[PDB]
Design a protein around this ligand. Sequence first.
Ligand code: ACV
Ligand code: FE
Length: 320
Amino acid sequence: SVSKANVPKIDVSPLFGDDQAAKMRVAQQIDAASRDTGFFYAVNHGINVQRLSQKTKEFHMSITPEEKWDLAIRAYNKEHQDQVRAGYYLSIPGKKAVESFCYLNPNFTPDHPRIQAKTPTHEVNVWPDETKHPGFQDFAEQYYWDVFGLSSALLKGYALALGKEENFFARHFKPDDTLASVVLIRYPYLDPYPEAAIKTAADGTKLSFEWHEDVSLITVLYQSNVQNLQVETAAGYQDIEADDTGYLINCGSYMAHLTNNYYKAPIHRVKWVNAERQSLPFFVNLGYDSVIDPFDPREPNGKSDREPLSYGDYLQNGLV
Ligand SMILES: CC(C)[C@@H](NC(=O)[C@H](CS)NC(=O)CCC[C@H](N)C(=O)O)C(=O)O
Ligand SMILES: [Fe+3]
């Protein structure tokens, strides 16, 4: 069978407070996990994940085909040319099992200067009808800000881990401008299950999502309690155990760039499981113009031979 990945449970609650030595001890655990498999579970995070799962289920199970077309991104609906990121990503019965809903910063309103300028990667969110989904928009926008707050705390820990002051990343992660997204992904139970929605890895593992690195600074993930993720290590792909009380955290390729691959973006994949489940990532993205000068925490002088890359350039290139 497959070996279990080392994915430690880190109590992140000190990152919300003012005990600086305790925060350093959290930062050390973040450093160790980031140098090993690249994954950890954040525990004691303060977010009501059971209610997130309930509200998400109520949405996924009640939205109708009509509503999905009305909310669809341009890949599924040619009438919606402004929807590249935000909206509904449809299933294709018989072919594509997964479906999802993506939303961006609630502050990206019609009057927001980056919306007025039509800057790439910025869009105004689309929402289902309030009478059909009562409370959903409000819940979802509040969730954005709850996970934003957890992510800001995690970014203080990553900064400390790397020998930086605790606002080194967080100062670029701001409510008025962050490019961060929430995706509410439904993986369905299907009988029979479409073979076209099952991919096969070179090692024979049946997959729902092939190997990749994340397009993010960090990724902050809730999943149901159905084991599915695997991480590539030197010892091969290893199983990430599920924990539906925690958030699974990893670095994305912008972190790898800034740190000269000291904190790698781990390669991971999703196993095929015929189970009704949820995958609810928050992609921690900075602002469009944010630039962090690359560095290397393994070199006496910290210098890297990588060129500065704005987050907007990174994101537009990555989302293709
Ligand atoms: C591994 C999970 C995080 C999940 N997959 C995913 O979320 C995958 C790979 S990280 N996500 C993406 O490709 C990027 C979505 C970006 C989003 N539309 C945005 O505009 O910001 C899954 O369960 O398949
Ligand atoms: Fe991923």
